Structure 1
């Protein structure tokens, strides 16, 4: 089981607001290159000011089974570097386009249509997901890259885990 099972894509947060029925969460509408934006619910209120959530490029895990979070069905998850004392949104390289896929020549494969909730194979992948010494996001040391644009990275969190 390697990273090829995950469907990682670039997205642009079109709109972001406090979740109407869960003030500790944000609800974002994200353009991920599909016909319609995906609704995403993120617990980033205590880590990123709302102003900095607007029109922001991010990396999303797109094949997790959608789940509700207070009457709000979350359809993807924003990839972040994290620790018990901080969370940082991973930044795609300049010029990334919604829908761009993060793939690895070292780990060839097509992502699952939907990660089976039962089994949770992402728990087996997460341990090898971390930013390196230079804050670049990696899977087993191989950088998250957008073909022809560059690598994805956290702002200050080095050697930090990336949760799924």
Structure 2
């Protein structure tokens, strides 16, 4: 269960950020993740970030999550952020990375594929078993001492020693 190779973390670009109709805590993002049309994803960063701090930025999306329909609007995936105290920041791949590319760990096998779909039940879903081992360190993202590597470099975060969620 504890195994990052089952996770599909890929690069997305935010084309639109829209305030949610009923629940205002959520931002309804539209994120081109390399597929035929951009995914709809809902992120509760509205409390700490405003719409411009998200728009036209490259983010990291956990993509092999099951589809949900939160509060009337639909949401397919989630944007990975790093938190430290009452600050929260997007995980950022170096600029110039190709949309859709898979973020892999240092020294992990790229042939080892992620799950087609992660479990509806949280307990059996690895991510929640892995999340304690997801940390930020000196501005770099880590899983159990291993750095996240994109095609252009390590995944940066404008924080240090932060927790990843």
Q: 1:121 aligns with which of 121, 126, 136?
A: 126
Q: TM-score, normalised by structure 1?
A: 0.92
Question: In the TM superposition, what is the alpha-carbon distance from 1:84 to its structure 2 partner?
Answer: 4.9
Match of 1:12 in 2: 13
The C-alpha deviation readout for 1:45-102, integer Å capped at 9, x for no partner, is 1221211221111010001112121111110100100145221111110101210111
Match of 1:145 in 2: 149
State the aligned residue count.
160
Gaps of 5+ in 2: none
Gaps of 5+ in 1: none
The C-alpha deviation readout for 1:9-41, integer Å capped at 9, x for no partner, is 000000001012211111011000000100000
Seen in structure 2, the aligned counterparts of structure 1 residues 61 and 49 have a Cα distance that, compared at 3 Å, is: same
Q: TM-score, normalised by structure 2?
A: 0.91
Give the stretch that moved more between structures: 48-57 or 7-16: 48-57
RMSD value over aligned CA atoms? 1.3
Seen in structure 2, the aligned counterparts of structure 1 residues 83 and 105 have a Cα distance that, compared at 3 Å, is: closer
* Residues in 1 aligned to 2:78 and 2:88: alpha-carbon distance in whole angstroms: 14
> After TM superposition, where is structure 1 displaced by more than 4 Å over at least 4 residues in a row?
none
Give the stretch that moved more between structures: 77-86 or 92-101: 77-86
Native 8 Å contact 1:92 1:146 kept in 2: yes
SS across alignment from 1:24 = coil
SS across alignment from 2:72 = coil
